[PDB]
Design a protein around this ligand. Sequence first.
Ligand SMILES: *[C@@H]1O[C@H](CO)[C@@H](O)[C@H](O)[C@H]1NC(C)=O
Ligand SMILES: *[C@@H]1O[C@H](CO)[C@@H](O)[C@H](O)[C@H]1NC(C)=O
Ligand SMILES: *[C@@H]1O[C@H](CO)[C@@H](O)[C@H](O)[C@H]1NC(C)=O
Lengths: 100, 30, 50, 262
Amino acid sequence: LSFELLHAPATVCGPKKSTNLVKNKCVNFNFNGLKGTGVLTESNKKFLPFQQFGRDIADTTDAVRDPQTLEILDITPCSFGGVSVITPGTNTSNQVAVLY
Amino acid sequence: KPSKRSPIEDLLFNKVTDLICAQKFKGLTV
Amino acid sequence: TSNFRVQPTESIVRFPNITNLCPFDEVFNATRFASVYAWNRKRISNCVAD
Amino acid sequence: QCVNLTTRTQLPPAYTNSFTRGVYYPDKVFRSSVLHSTQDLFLPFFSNVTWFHVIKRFDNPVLPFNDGVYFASIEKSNIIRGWIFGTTLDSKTQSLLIVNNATNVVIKVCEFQFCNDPFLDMESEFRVYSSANNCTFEYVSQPFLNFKNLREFVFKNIDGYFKIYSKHTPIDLPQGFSALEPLVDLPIGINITRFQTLLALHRSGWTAGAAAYYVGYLQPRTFLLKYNENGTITDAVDCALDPLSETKCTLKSFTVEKGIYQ
Ligand SMILES: *[C@@H]1O[C@H](CO)[C@@H](O)[C@H](O)[C@H]1NC(C)=O
Ligand SMILES: *[C@@H]1O[C@H](CO)[C@@H](O)[C@H](O)[C@H]1NC(C)=O
Ligand SMILES: *[C@@H]1O[C@H](CO)[C@@H](O)[C@H](O)[C@H]1NC(C)=O
């Protein structure tokens, strides 16, 4: 077996793998180049045959198509936010409250 | 009306009008 | 004071429904070969080689 | 074996104007109810394109392939069949052939010879090439399918990839708007400078359906396209034509209100 390598897209590269996906969970995900993080969920969007993934007004990846069941999923980055501390003066007490 | 507003206040509210999620899901909060 | 973020707990990978294997069977499991003076040459492209 | 005749009548072809035709999805991305501005190779609006008619009068000239070609065909009974692509079109370099068989389409890129006036003889005889040397790439797929048939194609070639976009329509091109979804991509990587077309003529009282085809050339331009709630491109605006369109792009909207804009 001899390998001919040229300045070509190299149509013979090898096999890929797969793993059972998860939904409604914060998880790092990969999709045939598209690789990000977020939460996967069933989508109500109705793509058309040759469209693979979707974008939004912010020009960011929003929806993807699973290349094993021809279904549409949505992605939402895992939750985040600032935190604040409510407290009376330390001259008075030491109890605090936390606001997310 | 439940809002307990006046006939006018209602028109002012109605006259003045999902990019919010997109901006939010980038690092900016309101 | 500070921030709060939720971290992922898993990593997932997905790819197309892999099929269309290269025709190695016609090479290795052929009915008959040819002699040394007629060594057989086969070209393989546009297929996923297992 | 081809016979060379000296009875052809020299007559320059016709000219017509493309109004709002030649719009294709420039990517595989989904967008809904959004006005998006892109820069790519498009066909300028209201542009002169060349008109050939075939019925005697034979019309299969040789024309350049500068950057990309928009090919329109108005026809009945499926006369136009295939295409030829290449640079010098002989056994000195590889050539690309697309042929629509009765139940398939075949694409072949390799060395070839052709007549000075190649032609194809229902189908009983197939002879357009005399020699077929070692062929780098083969491809087989499904068939692509006043006058009632209209076929619009866009052929491009860049970065070592050759792309064909297609659309069919049952109905001097008519008005309206039509999108041309991507059809096929090929990793060939040829130099491509010229191209030829193919039709089917059969010897035969006898009736031969006429056909007409329009050829237009692309150009790098900036367009503003509208995506509906489904994802279908329903309208587009080119903003190097007239001041009103340029204002429409600079405002990133289709309707312009009263005022003075810079
Ligand atoms: C994917 O491949 C499997 C394996 O043969 C097949 O059973 C299935 O129908 C294919 N399509 C899917 C899962 O959409
Ligand atoms: C453009 O087309 C019109 C009519 O089709 C013609 O009169 C004119 O000469 C053309 N201009 C060119 C080919 O530059
Ligand atoms: C757009 O999507 C809606 C809902 O899916 C559908 O009813 C409609 O036929 C689609 N096309 C147009 C042109 O509205």
